[PDB]
């Protein structure tokens, strides 16, 4: 078969600056017509996948301007000329050759922007929740960039480890920021043998961690 | 050619069978080959059948061969995909999209233009663990008031959730569903609001679990 396969697998572009994704395929894309059977979609968070460029260098009726191709034979390119908040995606290159059809990795393309702190709330648990014997502590992070964050639990100030699990949504296409939960999970008994529950946040827009508390339990 | 829609999708048990249906809307399929394509949890695009206008063409990947089998019907203007002897790995969301290429009488077209339409997708599930609709816990708010829904213990995916029957939409996010140790999924969904409004605002999280037939709302209050 035909293994397509791109590079770099990830990007992060300022909007208005360029950016440009290769593809390349194991074996000639190049037909004996005279045209190369590569084509380019993207598939947007939550969004039916889009046809971008069809035989490496068309660009398909609806597509902005700013999107074009290049290439021939096993290598080729698409090319943004000025990124917009909302190309936040996974783009992928597919050969149209031969059956079977076959894709490259995908490419996810992140919107760079300036460093935003998140907002911390913290959630105990509902008394609705604690008849079913299980606590749920929820600690929210809003609205932030980049994405990489530290969010460490403490129950009494006892450090907490393997007992929670963290979300985090797609960036957002017009303000280019993520949010993130993390949810401690711990049994009734255990809830209310404490009283004191924080969850401390790390992050690169914060000076120094953020912690948001709560007593009960 | 405007829109396609994917439906059949659902939970099987390994061995088991389901038949997808690609519907077209706007445009008749007939003059054109279809494709499916899925994409496995949190993992890219995977080609999986296709099948040309007049059915003479009928195309698999290797993975599906022998198990799932593609027809066409223009009275109904609808692609079908049979899957039979169904796997765990077969678990994806399915994609239907059309060509818009002739291909004359099979794989090749020289007058190529490429998928144009695709759909939103169908979610395939295939295991062995029964079907268990969510419960719903609010999440109380405590300037700008958080405040949100815990929707735990589901499976199988999808749920959806609104606000105040999508009367409320901005300031919210819903969190990827996570699969817990217990093998079941949860989620939060959240919002932020006046700290002023809580007084006199109502805020109901609307949470639908298709797979079970649950249908939950849950009034979030101080």
């Known amino acids: 078969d035909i293994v397509m396969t791109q590079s770099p697998l990830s990007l992060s572009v300022t909007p208005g600056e360029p950016a440009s994704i290769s593809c390349r395929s194991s074996?000639?894309?190049?037909?004996?017509?005279?045209?190369?059977?590569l084509d380019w979609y993207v598939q947007k968070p939550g969004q039916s996948p889009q046809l971008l460029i069809y035989?490496?260098?068309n660009r398909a009726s609806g597509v902005p301007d700013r999107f074009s191709g290049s290439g021939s034979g096993t290598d080729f390119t698409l090319k943004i000329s000025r990124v917009e908040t909302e190309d936040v995606g996974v783009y992928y290159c597919m050969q149209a050759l031969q059956i079977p059809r076959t894709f490259g990795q995908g490419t996810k393309v992140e919107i760079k922007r300036t460093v935003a702190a998140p907002s911390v709330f913290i959630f105990p648990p509902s008394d609705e929740q604690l008849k079913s014997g299980t606590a749920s502590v929820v600690c929210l992070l809003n609205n932030f960039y980049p994405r990489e964050a530290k969010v460490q639990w403490k129950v009494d100030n006892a450090l907490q480890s393997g007992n929670s699990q963290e979300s985090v949504t797609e960036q957002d296409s017009k303000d280019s920021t993520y949010s993130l939960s993390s949810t401690l999970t711990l049994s009734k008994a255990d809830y209310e043998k404490h009283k004191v529950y924080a969850c401390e946040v790390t992050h690169q827009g914060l000076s120094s961690p953020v912690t948001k508390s709560f007593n009960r339990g | 050619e405007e829109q396609v829609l994917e439906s059949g999708g659902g939970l099987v048990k390994p061995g088991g069978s389901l038949r997808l249906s690609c519907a077209a809307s706007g445009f008749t399929f007939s003059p054109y080959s279809v494709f499916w394509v899925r994409q496995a949890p949190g993992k890219g695009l995977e080609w999986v059948s296709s099948?040309?206008?007049?059915?003479?063409?009928?195309y698999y990947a290797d993975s599906v061969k022998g198990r799932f089998t593609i027809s066409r019907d223009n009275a109904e203007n609808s692609i079908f995909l049979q899957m039979n002897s169904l796997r765990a790995e077969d678990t994806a969301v399915y994609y239907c999209?059309?060509?818009?290429?002739?291909?004359?009488?099979?794989?090749?077209?020289?007058?190529?233009?490429?998928?144009?339409?695709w759909g939103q997708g169908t979610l395939v599930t295939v295991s062995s663990a029964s079907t268990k609709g969510p419960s719903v816990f609010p999440l109380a708010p405590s300037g700008t008031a958080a405040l949100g829904c815990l929707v735990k213990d589901y499976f199988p995916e999808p749920v959806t959730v609104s606000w105040n029957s999508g009367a409320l939409t901005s300031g919210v996010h819903t969190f990827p569903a996570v699969l817990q140790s217990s093998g079941l999924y949860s989620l939060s969904s959240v919002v932020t609001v006046p700290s002023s409004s809580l007084g006199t605002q109502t805020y109901i999280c609307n949470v639908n679990h298709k797979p079970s037939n649950t249908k939950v709302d849950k009034k979030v209050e101080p």
């Open positions: 999209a059309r060509d818009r290429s002739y291909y004359a009488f099979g794989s090749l077209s020289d007058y190529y233009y490429g998928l144009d339409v």
């Open positions: 035989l490496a260098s």
């Open positions: 074996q000639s894309l190049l037909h004996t017509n005279g045209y190369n059977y």
């Open positions: 099948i040309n206008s007049d059915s003479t063409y009928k």
